[PDB]
Amino acid sequence: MFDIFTRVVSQADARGEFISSDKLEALKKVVAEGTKRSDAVSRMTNNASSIVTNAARQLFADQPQLIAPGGNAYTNRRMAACLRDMEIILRYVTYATFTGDASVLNDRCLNGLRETYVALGVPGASVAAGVRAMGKAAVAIVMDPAGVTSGDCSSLQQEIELYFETAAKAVE
Amino acid sequence: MFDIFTRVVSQADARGEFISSDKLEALKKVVAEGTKRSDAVSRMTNNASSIVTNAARQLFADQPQLIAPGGNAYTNRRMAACLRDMEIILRYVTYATFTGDASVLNDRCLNGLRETYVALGVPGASVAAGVRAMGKAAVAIVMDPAGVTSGDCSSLQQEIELYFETAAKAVE
Amino acid sequence: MFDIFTRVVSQADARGEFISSDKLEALKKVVAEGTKRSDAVSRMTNNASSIVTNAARQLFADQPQLIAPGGNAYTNRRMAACLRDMEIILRYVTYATFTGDASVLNDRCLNGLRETYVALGVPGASVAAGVRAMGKAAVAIVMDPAGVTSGDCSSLQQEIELYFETAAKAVE
Amino acid sequence: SIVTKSIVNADAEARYLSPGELDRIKAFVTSGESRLRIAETLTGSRERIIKSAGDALFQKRPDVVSPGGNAYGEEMTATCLRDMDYYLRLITYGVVAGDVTPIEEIGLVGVREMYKSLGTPVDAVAQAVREMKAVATGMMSGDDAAEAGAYFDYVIGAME
Amino acid sequence: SIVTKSIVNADAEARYLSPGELDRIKAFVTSGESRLRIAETLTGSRERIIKSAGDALFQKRPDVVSPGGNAYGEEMTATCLRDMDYYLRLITYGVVAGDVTPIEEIGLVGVREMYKSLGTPVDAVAQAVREMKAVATGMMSGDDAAEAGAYFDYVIGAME
Amino acid sequence: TIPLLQYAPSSQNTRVAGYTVGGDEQPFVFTTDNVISDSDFDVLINAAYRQIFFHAFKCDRQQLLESQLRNGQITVRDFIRGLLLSETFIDSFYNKNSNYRFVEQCIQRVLGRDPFSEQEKIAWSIVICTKGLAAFVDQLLNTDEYMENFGYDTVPYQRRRSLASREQGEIPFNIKSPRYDAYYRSQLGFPQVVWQNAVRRFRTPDRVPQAGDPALFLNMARSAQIPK
Amino acid sequence: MKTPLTEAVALADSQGRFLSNTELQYLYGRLRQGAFALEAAQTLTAKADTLVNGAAQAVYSKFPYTTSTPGNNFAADQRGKDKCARDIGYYLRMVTYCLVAGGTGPMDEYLIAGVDEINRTFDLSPSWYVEALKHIKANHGLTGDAATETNNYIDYAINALS
Amino acid sequence: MKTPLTEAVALADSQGRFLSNTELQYLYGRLRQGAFALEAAQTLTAKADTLVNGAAQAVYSKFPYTTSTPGNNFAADQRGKDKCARDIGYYLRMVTYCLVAGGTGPMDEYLIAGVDEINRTFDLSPSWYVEALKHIKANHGLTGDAATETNNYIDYAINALS
Amino acid sequence: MKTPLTEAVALADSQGRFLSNTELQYLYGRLRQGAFALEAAQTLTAKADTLVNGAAQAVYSKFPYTTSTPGNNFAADQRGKDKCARDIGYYLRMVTYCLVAGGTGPMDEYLIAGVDEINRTFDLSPSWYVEALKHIKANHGLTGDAATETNNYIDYAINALS
Numbered sequence A, B, C: 001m002f003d004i005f006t007r008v009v010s011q012a013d014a015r016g017e018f019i020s021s022d023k024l025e026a027l028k029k030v031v032a033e034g035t036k037r038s039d040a041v042s043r044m045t046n047n048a049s050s051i052v053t054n055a056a057r058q059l060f061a062d063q064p065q066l067i068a069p070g071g072n073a074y075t076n077r078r079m080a081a082c083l084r085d086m087e088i089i090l091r092y093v094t095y096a097t098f099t100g101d102a103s104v105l106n107d108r109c110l111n112g113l114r115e116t117y118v119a120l121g122v123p124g125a126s127v128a129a130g131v132r133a134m135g136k137a138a139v140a141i142v143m144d145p146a147g148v149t150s151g152d153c154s155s156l157q158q159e160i161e162l163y164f165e166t167a168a169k170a171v172e
Numbered sequence D, E: 001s002i003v004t005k006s007i008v009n010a011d012a013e014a015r016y017l018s019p020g021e022l023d024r025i026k027a028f029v030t031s032g033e034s035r036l037r038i039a040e041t042l043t044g045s046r047e048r049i050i051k052s053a054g055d056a057l058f059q060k061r062p063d064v065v066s067p068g069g070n071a072y073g074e075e076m077t078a079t080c081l082r083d084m085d086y087y088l089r090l091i092t093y094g095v096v097a098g099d100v101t102p103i104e105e106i107g108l109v110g111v112r113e114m115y116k117s118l119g120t121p122v123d124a125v126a127q128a129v130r131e132m133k134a135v136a137t138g139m140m141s142g143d144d145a146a147e148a149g150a151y152f153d154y155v156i157g158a159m160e
Numbered sequence F: 001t002i003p004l005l006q007y008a009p010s011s012q013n014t015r016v017a018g019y020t021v022g023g024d025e026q027p028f029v030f031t032t033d034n035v036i037s038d039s040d041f042d043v044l045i046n047a048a049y050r051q052i053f054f055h056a057f058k059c060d061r062q063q064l065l066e067s068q069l070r071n072g073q074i075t076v077r078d079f080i081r082g083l084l085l086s087e088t089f090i091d092s093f094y095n096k097n098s099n100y101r102f103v104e105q106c107i108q109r110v111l112g113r114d115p116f117s118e119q120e121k122i123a124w125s126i127v128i129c130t131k132g133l134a135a136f137v138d139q140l141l142n143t144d145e146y147m148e149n150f151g152y153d154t155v156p157y158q159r160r161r162s163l164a165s166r167e168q169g170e171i172p173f174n175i176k177s178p179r180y181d182a183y184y185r186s187q188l189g190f191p192q193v194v195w196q197n198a199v200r201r202f203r204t205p206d207r208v209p210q211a212g213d214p215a216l217f218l219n220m221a222r223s224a225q226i227p228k
Numbered sequence G, H, I: 001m002k003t004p005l006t007e008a009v010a011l012a013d014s015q016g017r018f019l020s021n022t023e024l025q026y027l028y029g030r031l032r033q034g035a036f037a038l039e040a041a042q043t044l045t046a047k048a049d050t051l052v053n054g055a056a057q058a059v060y061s062k063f064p065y066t067t068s069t070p071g072n073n074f075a076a077d078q079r080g081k082d083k084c085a086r087d088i089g090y091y092l093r094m095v096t097y098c099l100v101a102g103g104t105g106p107m108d109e110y111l112i113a114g115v116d117e118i119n120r121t122f123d124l125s126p127s128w129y130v131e132a133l134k135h136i137k138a139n140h141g142l143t144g145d146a147a148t149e150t151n152n153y154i155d156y157a158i159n160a161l162s
C-alpha cells in the first residue's frame, strides 16, 4: 500500500534527510504525466468486461482441456470462479496503475495466490497465459486513438506491461 | 462428504459420460442391502454408551499407566475428555456406515486428529488399541441375532471392520 | 501460570504421594520470607516509570543508531512502542517475583517475543542490553535502605537477577 | 556346525575322523530333515513369537519399560523387539546347524560387554529368551519342542 | 572438488600450485558459506522437489507411465522417484564440492550403459532432471538459482 | 493506544465473493431470529459451546449466560463475549497457550477465518497486554468482518471451510487447533512410554526398508497421479 | 451436495448426537424413492441422444434468430451447434445425476451455482435453456411417480434459471 | 423438538431455499413409519398401567435396599412409591409421545435435558430408571418393526441416562 | 488453578495495570492462611492412611449393598476395593493439595471438572464419595481455624459432588 509520493517519502525518511531536488523534478514530471497515466487507465477501465470475456474466450479456445470434463475450469461454478479470479487480477492491475506503484498489486494478490493455485490444483500456466493475453489486449485497447488528443504514451505502455508481467510471473 | 450415490455420480461426471449399466445394478443391489446395512447401524447405535464404557473399561484395565498419576488420561478432566474423544470416534464411524462411505469419517476426524494427538502428547497407540477393541465389540454386538429375522451381514461386517481399521490406522 | 505452592503441588502430584516434610519446612521458610520477597517487590513497583525512562535514557545514549534516522526505534510511533515493550517486560518481571515463579514470565513473554523481534527486524541485542541495564537499576533501587527495617534482602537479589537474566537471555 | 566341530577336533589331533564321529555326522545328516521342519516352524511364525514373548516379558519385568529402564519409549521398545528378533534368528541358525557354534560365534561371545556398555540388565534379556522359549515350545510337538528348547536353553544359559 | 582438481592438475605438471589456482581455492573457500546455504535449501525441501518434478514429468512424458513404458506400476514409479532422489542428492553433493566431480564420478559415467541395460529412455530422465531444475530454481533467489542451475545444467548435459 | 502496524492480507477463500448455493458442506447457521422454542434455544446454545471451546462440560457451562439468552435481554454476540471472557475459556486457552498462539486460536474461532499471516497475529497480540483481554475481545468483536458475516445474533462458524464439489474441504478448526500448544505439552512431560504398542509395532529387521530399497518412496508413488 | 443421507448425517453431526429413528425414516423413504428412480434414470440414459437433438431443434424452432444472426454466442455457425448441444447434454446428464443421487445436489453443485453470472458474461439467454428443459420434460416419455419427480427436478432447474 | 418434518423445515429454512424432493422423501418415509407407529402407541396406551407396576416391582426387586433404608429419596414410605411410580408413568408416557411424534424430540425436551442435574441434586441413581426401562422394553409385548423402533426409543433413553 | 496469588496476577493483568495495595492485602492474608495451613497439611499427611481405611469402612457400612452385588462398579471383589480405596486416597490427597495451595484450584482441576460425567458413565453414585468425605471431615481430628477451613474444602467437594 504505497503511492509514488509515499514511496519517495518512505525512501527519503529511510535516508533520514529531506527530499533531494532531482526527485522533486521527477515528481513534478510525474504530476505532469499522472493525468496522462490515468486517462488511459480510464480507457482501460471502461472495457474491462470485454477484456476478461475476450481473454477467457481466447484462453478456452486455446486450451480446451479446461473446458473438457475433469478439467479445472470445467464445472459451471468453477468456471464462474475462474472468470472471477481473472476479473480480480485485472482490477488490481488497474489499481496499481492508478496509484502508480506495484506495491498494491503485490499486497493484494501476489504473495498468496501462487500458493492458493498450488493448493487448489489450479494450473498456474493457463492463468499465467490468460493474464498475459489479457494484458496484451489491454495495451492494445489502450494504445489506439479514437477521438483523443495525441500524446506519447511510451512509458505508460512500459509501466502497464510491467504490471501485467509482474502479475503473470507471480502467478506462475 | 459423499454418499455411495454421490460417489458414483462424481466418478461418472469425472468420466464425463452417463452412468454405466453395471454400476446401476451395483447400486440397485446397494439399495436392496442399504436397509440391511442399516439394521446393523441401528443395533450398533443403540448400545453406544455401553460400547464406549466397556472399551475404556478394558483399555484402562489393560494399560494402567494412563490411570496412574502423571498418565495422559489420569486427571478427571482429561479422563472425561478421553471418553469424549472415544465417543466422537464411534459416532463418526456410525455416520460413515450410515452414508456407506468412508469420506465422512476421513473429513471429520482423520486428517487432523493424528497431529492433534502428537501436539497434545496423547499416546496414539492406546487410543488406536481402544478404537480396535471398540470396533471388535461393535461387530460382536452387531452380529448376534436377538429377536431379528435371520439375514446375511457378511459384507457389512467387512465394511464396518474396514471403517474401524481405517480409524485406528489414521489415529496411529 | 504457577505459584511456588502450586509448583510444589504439581511436583507432589506427579510424584503421586503427599508432600514430604522438608518441602513443607522450605515452604514455611518461603511463607516467612514471602513478605520479605514482596516489600522488595513494592519498592521495585513504585519506581517503575523512572526505571524504564532511565533505562531507555542510558540505552539511547549508548546506542545512538536507534535514534538515528533509519534506526529501529527512530520513528516517534516506534519509539513509543519501544518504551511500551520495555514497560511490559518490567511488569511481567514484577509479576514473576510477586508469584515467586518464573513460569508466569515464561508464559507471558518469552517463547514468542524472540520470534517477534526477529520477524519485526527489531535488534534483539539492544533490548537485551536494555533489560540488563533495567535489571541492574532495579536491584540498585531495591537494595538501598530509606526508612525500612533491616532485612535479608540478598537471596531475593539472587531471584530478581535470575528473572532479569532469564528475560534478557530469552530475548537475545 | 557338527561337521566343522568334528573336522576341527580331528584336525588338532593330527588324525582322520574316527568312525564314531563319522556316524555322528551321518546321524546329523539323517536328522537334518526334522531340523529343517523345526526351522520352518520357527521361521514362519516369528511375528507371533516376538509379539507374545515381548508381551509376556513386559508383563513379567515391567521396570525396563517404566521410565528409568532401558527399553522405555517407542523406539527403545522397537529396538528391544529387534534384539529379540536377532536372538530368534540365531536360534533358527543353531537349529539348522545342529550345534551352537552359530549362536555362540555370532551373538553370545561379548554379550555381557555389549549389554553392559548399553546399560542393559542381562537377566531381563534372559527372561525375554525364556518367554520366547515358552511361546516357541508351545507351538510344536514334543520332540520338536525338546530339540528347539535345547538351543533356547543354551542361549539362556550363556546369558547367565 | 576444486582442491582435488587443482592438486591433480598441478600434480601431473610436476609443479606446485600456481598462485592463480591458489586464489581460485581461496575464492571457493570464501563462497563455501553460500554453497552450504544452497545445499540446505536443496536438502530441506527435497520432498516437494521430487513430488512436483515427478508430477510435471509424468504430465510431460506420459508414455513411460502408460502400460508399455518403463515406470509403469506402483513399484516402478517408486523406483523412478528414487532415481530422481539419487540425482537430487548428487546435485547437493556437487553444490557443496564446488565442482561436478562428485556428480560425474558417482552417477554419470556409465549412465548410458546402465539405462540401456534397464530399458530406460534417457531423454525422459533428462526431462526429469529438467523438471527438478525448474522446481529447484523456482525455490531460490537469483544467484542461488544460477549456481544450482549450473549443476542441474551439467546433469542434463551429461545425459545427452 | 497507538494504532496497529498495517499488515498484508493473504489470499483466502473468504476474500473472494464466492458463488455457492445451499450445500451440505456449507455449515449450519444458528440465529436467534428463527428459533424461539426452549428446545431450539438449547440446540443453539450447544452449537455456540461447540464452536467456542470444542466440548463443554457441565461445570464448564454458564447458567447465567444461557439463562439470560433465553429471554432476549442478551444477544448471541454478547453470549460469545461472555464465553470469551469466561474464566474456564481463559484457563483452558489463554493460560496454556502463548500470547501469539492465543491470538491465533481466538481469531480462528471468533472471526471464523484463519489469520492471514503471522504478522497479523503479531499486530493483534499487543492489544491483549496493553489493554487487557476484555478490551481485546471488545476490539475483536466490533470489526467489519464479524459484523458483516454474523452480526448480532448469528453464532460464529468457519466460513467457506469446504469448497463446492470437493471431496475434502479443510480441517475443522476444532480438530486442527488444539487447546494447548507444544510448550505446555513439554511442561506436562506428556510423551508417554507405550511398551504395549512396540510389541505390535515390531516388524522383523529384514522386512524394514533400507536406504537402497524403493519401499520408502512407494507412498509417493501411490499418492501421485498418473494420466492414462 | 444436498442428498438426503448426507443432510441427515449433517443434521446429526451439527446437533452433536447419534442417529435416531428420524434418519431411519429418511432412509426407508430414500430407498422407496431409489427403487423406481434408478430404473427411470436408466430409461433416460436410453432415450438421451434423441431427447438432446429434439430439445436443440425445439430451441432453434422457438428462437429462430439464434440460427440467423452472426455472433459467437449464437449457434449460427457449426461450432455454436456443437457447444450448444453439448450443454443440452450437460443439462440432461445433470438431470440423470440428480435422479440417481436422490436430491437436487448434483445440479446445484454442477450447474446452478454459477449459471447466472455465466449467462451474464456470455450473453446467453436462460430462456433458451428453459425452452429446452420444457421440451425435455414434455418428451421424456416416463410414466407415474418417476415421471412426476423427474418433472420436479426439471422444474427445479427451470425455477433456478428464471 | 427433533421430529423429522420439523427438522426438514429447519434445514430448508437455514439453507434459505424452498422444499425439494429430499423433504418429500423424508415425508413418504415418515408416513411409512407412522402407519404402524400410531397403532403401536395405542397398544402401549392399553398395556400402560400393568407395565408401570411391573417396572416398579422389578426395580424394587433388583434394588431391595431402596425399600428398606429411611430416606426421602428412597421409596421406603408410601409417598416415595406414589412419586416413584409417577415417574415410571412419566417415562412410559414420554416413550408413547416419541412413538406418536416420530422422533426423540419429546423425550429430549421433557426428560433428557435436565435429568442429569436432577439426579445429581436429588440423590437418585439413574440405574433405577435403566432397570425400569429394561423391564419395559422386555415386557411391552409388541412384535415386528414397531417393536424394534420402540426398543430403539427405550435404548435411546437408556443411553441418555448412563 | 484458582489460587489467590495467581488470581491476583490475573486481575492485574486483565486490567492491564501494575500491582496495587490490593494484591499486597491479598498477600499478607495468604501468608496468614498458610502459616497454619502448611502444618495442618502435614498433620493430615500423618493421619492419611488410617483416615482412608476408616472412610472406606464407613462407606461399606452405610452402603452395604456395594459389598454384596456382583458388578464391576461395585466393590464386591478385591480389585474394586483396591481401586476404590485408591480414589479415597485421591480425594484425601486433593484435600491436602488444596490445603497447601491455599485455594480450591487443585481439586477443581484434578477432581471436579469431569467428575459428573465420569460418575454418569461408570454407574458410580456420588453419595458414596459424599459419605466418605463426611467421615473424613468428622474424623480428621484437627482443631481451630485450620479445622474450619479444612472442613470448608471438604464441604466444597461435597457441594461440587451433589
Ligand SMILES: CCC1=C(C)/C(=C/C2=NC(=C\c3[nH]c(/C=C4\NC(=O)[C@H](C)[C@H]4CC)c(C)c3CCC(=O)O)/C(CCC(=O)O)=C2C)NC1=O
Pocket (backbone or CB within 6 Å): A066, A072, A073, A077, A078, A079, A081, A082, A083, A085, A086, A088, A089, A108, A109, A113, A116, A120, A122, A123, A124, A125, A126, A127, A130, F011, F012, F013, F014, F015, F016, F017, F018, F019, F163, F164
Ligand atoms: C484478491 C485476490 C484473490 C485471488 C487471486 C483469489 C483466488 C482464488 N481462486 C480460487 C478458485 C479458482 N480460481 C480458478 C481460476 C482458474 N483456474 C483455472 O482453471 C484457470 C487456470 C484459472 C482461470 C484464469 C478456478 C477454476 C477456481 C475454482 C476452484 C474450485 O472452486 O474448486 C479460490 C478458492 C475459493 C473460491 O474461489 O471461491 C481463491 C481463494 N482469491 C482472492 O481473494
Ligand SMILES: CCC1=C(C)/C(=C/C2=NC(=C\c3[nH]c(/C=C4\NC(=O)[C@H](C)[C@H]4CC)c(C)c3CCC(=O)O)/C(CCC(=O)O)=C2C)NC1=O
Pocket (backbone or CB within 6 Å): A035, A036, A039, A040, A042, A142, A143, A144, A145, A148, A149, A150, A151, A152, A153, A156
Ligand atoms: C476523469 C475524467 C477525465 C478524463 C477521462 C480526462 C482526460 C483527459 N485527457 C487529456 C489529455 C490527454 N490524454 C492523452 C492520452 C493518450 N494519448 C495517446 O495517444 C495515448 C495512446 C493515450 C495514453 C495511453 C493525451 C496524449 C493527452 C494530451 C493532453 C495532456 O497531456 O493532458 C485531457 C486534457 C484536457 C482536455 O482534454 O480537455 C483530458 C481532459 N480528463 C478528465 O477530467
Ligand SMILES: CCC1=C(C)/C(=C/C2=NC(=C\c3[nH]c(/C=C4\NC(=O)[C@H](C)[C@H]4CC)c(C)c3CCC(=O)O)/C(CCC(=O)O)=C2C)NC1=O
Pocket (backbone or CB within 6 Å): B066, B072, B073, B077, B078, B079, B081, B082, B083, B085, B086, B088, B089, B108, B109, B113, B116, B120, B122, B123, B124, B125, B126, B127, B130, F054, F055, F174, F175, F177, F178, F179, F180
Ligand atoms: C470431531 C473430531 C475431533 C477429535 C478426534 C478431537 C480430539 C481432541 N482430543 C483432545 C484431548 C484429549 N483426547 C484425549 C484422549 C486420549 N488420550 C489418552 O490418554 C488416550 C490414549 C485417549 C483416550 C482414547 C485426552 C486424555 C485429552 C485431554 C488432553 C488435555 O486436556 O490436556 C483435544 C484437545 C482439546 C480438548 O479436548 O478439550 C482435541 C481437539 N477433537 C475433535 O473435535
Ligand SMILES: CCC1=C(C)/C(=C/C2=NC(=C\c3[nH]c(/C=C4\NC(=O)[C@H](C)[C@H]4CC)c(C)c3CCC(=O)O)/C(CCC(=O)O)=C2C)NC1=O
Pocket (backbone or CB within 6 Å): B032, B033, B035, B036, B039, B040, B042, B142, B143, B144, B145, B148, B149, B150, B151, B152, B153, G021, G024, G025, G028, H145, H148, H149
Ligand atoms: C428404524 C426402524 C426399522 C428397523 C429396525 C427396520 C429393520 C428391518 N430389517 C429388515 C431386514 C433385515 N434385517 C436383517 C438383519 C440381520 N439378519 C441377520 O441374520 C444378521 C445377524 C442381522 C444383521 C447383523 C436381515 C438379514 C434382513 C433381511 C431383509 C433385508 O435385507 O432388509 C427390514 C426389511 C423390511 C421388514 O422387515 O419389514 C426391516 C423393516 N426397519 C425399520 O424401519
Ligand SMILES: CCC1=C(C)/C(=C/C2=NC(=C\c3[nH]c(/C=C4\NC(=O)[C@H](C)[C@H]4CC)c(C)c3CCC(=O)O)/C(CCC(=O)O)=C2C)NC1=O
Pocket (backbone or CB within 6 Å): C066, C072, C073, C077, C078, C079, C081, C082, C083, C085, C086, C088, C089, C108, C109, C113, C116, C120, C122, C123, C124, C125, C126, C127, C130, F004, F005, F099, F122, F123, F125, F126, F127, F129
Ligand atoms: C505481553 C508480551 C508482549 C511483547 C514482549 C510484545 C512485543 C512487540 N513489540 C512490537 C514492536 C516494537 N518493539 C520495539 C522495541 C524495541 N525495538 C528496538 O529498537 C529496541 C531494541 C527495543 C526497545 C527496547 C519497537 C521499536 C517496535 C516497533 C516496530 C514497529 O512498530 O514497526 C510488536 C509489534 C506490534 C506493535 O507494537 O504495536 C510486538 C507484538 N508484544 C507483547 O504483547
Ligand SMILES: CCC1=C(C)/C(=C/C2=NC(=C\c3[nH]c(/C=C4\NC(=O)[C@H](C)[C@H]4CC)c(C)c3CCC(=O)O)/C(CCC(=O)O)=C2C)NC1=O
Pocket (backbone or CB within 6 Å): C032, C033, C035, C036, C039, C040, C042, C142, C143, C144, C145, C148, C149, C150, C151, C152, C153, I020, I021, I024, I025, I028
Ligand atoms: C502492600 C502494602 C504493604 C507493605 C509495603 C508492607 C510492607 C512490610 N514489610 C514488612 C517487613 C519487612 N520488610 C523488609 C524489607 C527489607 N529490609 C531490608 O533491609 C531490605 C533492603 C528490604 C528488602 C529488599 C524486611 C527486612 C522486613 C522485616 C519483617 C518481615 O520479614 O516481614 C512488613 C511486616 C509487618 C509490618 O511491618 O508491620 C510490612 C508491613 N506490608 C503491607 O501490607
Ligand SMILES: CCC1=C(C)/C(=C/C2=NC(=C\c3[nH]c(/C=C4\NC(=O)[C@H](C)[C@H]4CC)c(C)c3CCC(=O)O)/C(CCC(=O)O)=C2C)NC1=O
Pocket (backbone or CB within 6 Å): E064, E069, E070, E071, E072, E076, E077, E079, E080, E081, E083, E084, E086, E087, E090, E106, E107, E118, E120, E121, E124, E125, E128, F212
Ligand atoms: C546415484 C546414481 C545411480 C542411479 C541413477 C541408479 C539407478 C538405478 N535405477 C534402477 C531402476 C529404475 N530407474 C527407473 C527410472 C526411470 N524410468 C523412467 O521411466 C523415468 C524416466 C526414470 C526416473 C524418473 C525405473 C523405471 C527403474 C526400474 C527398471 C526395471 O525395473 O527394469 C536400478 C535397478 C534397481 C535398483 O537397485 O535400484 C538402479 C541401480 N543407481 C545409482 O546408483
Ligand SMILES: CCC1=C(C)/C(=C/C2=NC(=C\c3[nH]c(/C=C4\NC(=O)[C@H](C)[C@H]4CC)c(C)c3CCC(=O)O)/C(CCC(=O)O)=C2C)NC1=O
Pocket (backbone or CB within 6 Å): A057, A060, A067, A074, A075, A076, A079, G059, G066, G072, G073, G074, G075, G079, G080, G081, G083, G084, G085, G087, G088, G090, G091, G110, G111, G118, G122, G124, G128
Ligand atoms: C455441466 C453444466 C455446464 C453448463 C450448462 C455449461 C454452459 C456453458 N456454455 C458455454 C458457452 C455456450 N453455450 C452455448 C449454448 C447455446 N447458445 C445458443 O445459441 C443455443 C440457444 C444454446 C445451445 C444449447 C453456446 C453456443 C456456447 C459457446 C458460446 C461461447 O463462446 O461462449 C460456456 C462457456 C465455455 C465456452 O465458451 O465454451 C459454459 C461454461 N458449462 C457447463 O459446464
Ligand SMILES: CCC1=C(C)/C(=C/C2=NC(=C\c3[nH]c(/C=C4\NC(=O)[C@H](C)[C@H]4CC)c(C)c3CCC(=O)O)/C(CCC(=O)O)=C2C)NC1=O
Pocket (backbone or CB within 6 Å): H059, H066, H072, H073, H074, H075, H079, H080, H081, H083, H084, H085, H087, H088, H090, H091, H110, H111, H118, H122, H124, H128
Ligand atoms: C416427565 C419427566 C419427569 C421425570 C422423570 C421427573 C423426575 C423427578 N423425580 C423426582 C423425585 C423422585 N423420584 C423418585 C423415584 C424413585 N426413587 C426410588 O427409590 C425409586 C427407585 C424410583 C421410583 C421410580 C422418588 C421417590 C422421588 C421423590 C423424592 C424427592 O423428594 O425428591 C423429582 C423432584 C420433584 C419432587 O421432589 O417431587 C423430579 C423432577 N420429573 C419429571 O417431570
Ligand SMILES: CCC1=C(C)/C(=C/C2=NC(=C\c3[nH]c(/C=C4\NC(=O)[C@H](C)[C@H]4CC)c(C)c3CCC(=O)O)/C(CCC(=O)O)=C2C)NC1=O
Pocket (backbone or CB within 6 Å): B057, B060, B067, B074, B075, B076, B079, I059, I066, I072, I073, I074, I075, I079, I080, I081, I083, I084, I085, I087, I088, I090, I091, I110, I111, I118, I122, I124, I128
Ligand atoms: C485424582 C482424582 C480422581 C478420581 C476421584 C478418580 C475416580 C475414578 N474412579 C474410577 C473407577 C472406580 N471407582 C470406584 C470406587 C468405588 N466404588 C465403590 O463401590 C465404592 C463405594 C467406591 C470406593 C471409593 C471403583 C470400585 C472403580 C472401578 C470401577 C471401574 O471399572 O470403572 C475411574 C475409572 C478408571 C477405572 O475404570 O479404573 C475414575 C477415573 N480418578 C481420578 O483420577
